[PDB]
Amino acid sequence: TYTTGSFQLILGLNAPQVISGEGEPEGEVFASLASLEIKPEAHVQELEIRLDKDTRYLTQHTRNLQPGDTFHALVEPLPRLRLTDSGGKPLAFGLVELNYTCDQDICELVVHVDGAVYRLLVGINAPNLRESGQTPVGS
Amino acid sequence: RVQHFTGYIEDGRGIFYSLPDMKQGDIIYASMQNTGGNLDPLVGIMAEEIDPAVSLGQVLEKANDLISELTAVADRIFLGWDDDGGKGYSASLEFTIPRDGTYHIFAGSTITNQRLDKFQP
Numbered sequence: 304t305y306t307t308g309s310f311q312l313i314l315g316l317n318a319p320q321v322i323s324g325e326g327e328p329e330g331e332v333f334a335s336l337a338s339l340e341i342k343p344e345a346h347v348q349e350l351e352i353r354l355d356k357d358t359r360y361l362t363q364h365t366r367n368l369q370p371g372d373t374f375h376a377l378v379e380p381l382p383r384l385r386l387t388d389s390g391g392k393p394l395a396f397g398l399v400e401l402n403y404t405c406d407q408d409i410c411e412l413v414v415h416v417d418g419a420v421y422r423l424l425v426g427i428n429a430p431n432l433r434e435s436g437q438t439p440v441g442s
Numbered sequence: 443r444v445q446h447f448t449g450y451i452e453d454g455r456g457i458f459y460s461l462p463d464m465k466q467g468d469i470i471y472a473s474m475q476n477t478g479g480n481l482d483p484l485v486g487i488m489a490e491e492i493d494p495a496v497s498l499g500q501v502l503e504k505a506n507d508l509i510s511e512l513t514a515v516a517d518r519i520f521l522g523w524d525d526d527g528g529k530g531y532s533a534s535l536e537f538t539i540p541r542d543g544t545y546h547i548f549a550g551s552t553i554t555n556q557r558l559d560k561f562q563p
């Protein structure tokens with residue numbers, strides 16, 4: 304099978320002490336992330352939600368977002384929609400559609416939908432949620 | 443030139459600090475950190491001392507219903523401000539002194555939500 308986890312990578316150029324695994328950063332950089340040269344991979348997910356008489360408020364938690372990422376959400380059956388962080392400090396409000404961009408090193412987001420059955424569509428790095436086309440992709 | 447201050451905030455009642463006779467070309471720096479409780483720091487700088495309570499209260503009364511309204515009101519009340527520029531929810535501010543004169547520094551609490559079951563600023 305394959306394996307999963309986090310890793311630390313040390314690269315050196317004409318620095319024979321790197322193979323010992325203890326090389327401290329020095330000099331001027333020479334390599335960079337390759338993925339930054341192109342567009343990021345989008346993730347799209349769709350959910351059907353229902354607001355019963357006693358369950359008019361619903362919340363969902365998102366995975367972590369890296370800096371520079373973007374978040375999009377829309378709802379089509381109108382209830383109110385808003386976005387807050389894990390503490391709860393508001394970040395964006397629905398106009399229903401919503402948009403946000405990540406500034407902090409790690410962003411943890413919570414989607415609020417409050418008011419019947421509605422369709423909720425959500426995406427990361429996917430501004431094309433209006434006309435996705437593809438079946439839900441990514442994680 | 444560095445100075446320290448300590449205080450207490452109760453139910454969004456801020457504290458004013460006076461900066462007598464600054465000179466044009468000076469650079470002001472500010473940083474505010476939480477040392478107890480659930481305080482969320484906010485810092486702003488202005489020339490004429492006016493209590494922001496009356497203006498900020500209308501933002502709570504209108505409960506981008508929060509962030510845009512707070513930004514629009516702050517950009518009117520203060521010449522410069524910062525909410526979360528530091529480590530965590532702490533604020534940090536750099537402000538170049540426009541002209542010659544005196545100014546005021548305002549320290550207090552921002553409007554935030556701290557719940558996941560319901561929204562209540």
Ligand SMILES: [Ca+2]
Pocket residue numbers: 482483484525526531532533552
């Ligand atoms: Ca803050």
